[PDB]
Design a binder for this molecule. Sequence first.
Ligand SMILES: *C(=O)N1C[C@H](NOS(=O)(=O)O)CC[C@H]1C(=O)NNC(C)=O
Length: 260
Amino acid sequence: TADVQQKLAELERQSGGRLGVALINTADNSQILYRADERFAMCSTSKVMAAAAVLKKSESEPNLLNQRVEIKKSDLVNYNPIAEKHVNGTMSLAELSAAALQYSDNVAMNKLIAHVGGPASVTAFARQLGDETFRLDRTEPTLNTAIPGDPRDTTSPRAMAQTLRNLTLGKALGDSQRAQLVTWMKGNTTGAASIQAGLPASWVVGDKTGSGGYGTTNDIAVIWPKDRAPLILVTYFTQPQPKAESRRDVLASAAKIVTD
Ligand SMILES: *C(=O)N1C[C@H](NOS(=O)(=O)O)CC[C@H]1C(=O)NNC(C)=O
């Protein structure tokens, strides 16, 4: 375990940025932590908590996921690959959740945040799960500014890994809702170059990526290797320069270091 820490510190030094890692290995409950109690801007990885809040709401409101939401041209923001195909049409809350999680559609995320009552309502759902660190302050895309020292829209790798474990494997959601969140994350289309690129190809992975200002490049994942116990992995990364380019390769390298 002294070797894995040295490897992460060296990966961080070579990258020029700030790396946050939290690995929970459910096989023995061991953890690998690197800046796991420091805050980082979640960017689009916050979409997991917004979809989960709607899933929690659906437990006491039958057929909530079938409720329809109109998409208007005025709702469109910087990245809406699914919503832009439904302008003057409607999408169900299930379709918005799938679009937010699988394509990282920002309009879909804003509909989810709005549905639960706004950013503070998403934060309140996090508190109800025992997550005292997560905070959602803004909507998409301003929640992705990732200004160094700004606590808005941040969490810690430790907090997010524990929450992701509670959501996907634990009892934070009702059985059906947990299975639905797992199905949505397994269907993600945006993660091939991030955590997944550091893992054996055959491993079943559910993840949610994100990126923002200051070259912020993130990924959160539940990993299920065949015939093994699952792992929960959060890899957050940020850089000194406001217009730095993304570093998905750093997340892949970190995933390989902590899983070898
Ligand atoms: C979330 O981080 N988003 C939305 C989208 N996510 O895709 S990723 O998960 O593959 O990264 C694109 C990046 C980010 C976003 O909106 N970035 N741009 C701005 C202006 O914030």
